[model samples]
Target chain A: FVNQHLCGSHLVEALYLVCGERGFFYTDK
Target chain B: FVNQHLCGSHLVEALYLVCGERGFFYTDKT
Candidate 1:
């Protein structure tokens, strides 16, 4: 997440979203 | 990632913010 400029918020958000979405889609469908 | 606050700035900042809110919210109305 840390590059020339780090957006920790975005990274965390991605973690949650991807985790959440993956779980939702994978489990449901 | 650490209850003893073991190591890493990444985990440190993550902890600081994580317990603060669920956090900063990833609102997925998609």
Candidate 2:
């Protein structure tokens, strides 16, 4: 979340990628 | 799942809390 503004665009795509291999939701998939 | 229903109030609060230390975002300050 270094620059995650949670605004302007869809949060899902951001979070999904942010929560990627080296991020969150490690296995909640 | 099970009993999780945004069919109520405070979805963020529910999911935030439901996502405990061992759940997803374990290092994202769940």
Candidate 3:
């Protein structure tokens, strides 16, 4: 049987990449 | 001036990206 990897941490990593340490917030123009 | 990409925080490292660090912030009521 083939194994599948569900790396939820990967999503968190991606968010970190997009939103850095300070975290993401809403913006209005 | 064609200012784009911002690249404001691209200069920051991955590990260094966190709260209370040397970065930008936001405020209400613009």
Candidate 4:
């Protein structure tokens, strides 16, 4: 799996739209 | 194609803006 790490809210939101509820996971790290 | 992907920018600034940076890559998408 290609894990693309991003910062900030915009990027996070974009990821959400692209991933469509499948993206943006919460990690302990 | 207006695929305005964003990464690491202020939300307030983004709201006023129409476009953003490119999207990141995922294994399946790529």
Q: Candidate 3 docking: what grade?
A: incorrect
Q: Write the per-residue lDDT of candidate 2 for residues B1-30, one digit (tens) a residue.
A: 566455222343344446533334323323
For model 1, residues B1-30, the per-residue Cα lDDT tens digits are: 455743333443454366543323232334
Best by TM-score: 4
Q: Give the winner by lDDT: 2 or 3.
A: 3
- Give candidate 1 misplaced runs (Cα > 4 Å): A1-6, A21-29, B1-30
- TM-scores, all candidates, are 0.27, 0.23, 0.26, 0.29
**What value does the interface RMSD of model 3 take?**
10.1
Question: Across residues A1-29, which tens digit of lDDT does each residue of candidate 3 receive?
Answer: 12312444444554556665567544334
Tens digits of per-residue lDDT for model 2, A1-29: 32432331234335544654444442232
Q: Chain A: TM-score in each candidate? A: 0.38, 0.32, 0.40, 0.40
Candidate 1 vs 4: which has more TM-score: 4
Task: Output the number of the lDDT-best candidate.
Answer: 4
Highest DockQ scorer? 2
**Which scores better on TM-score, 1 or 3?**
1
- In order, what DockQ does each candidate have? 0.05, 0.15, 0.07, 0.04
Worst 10 residues of 3 chain B by lDDT: B1-10
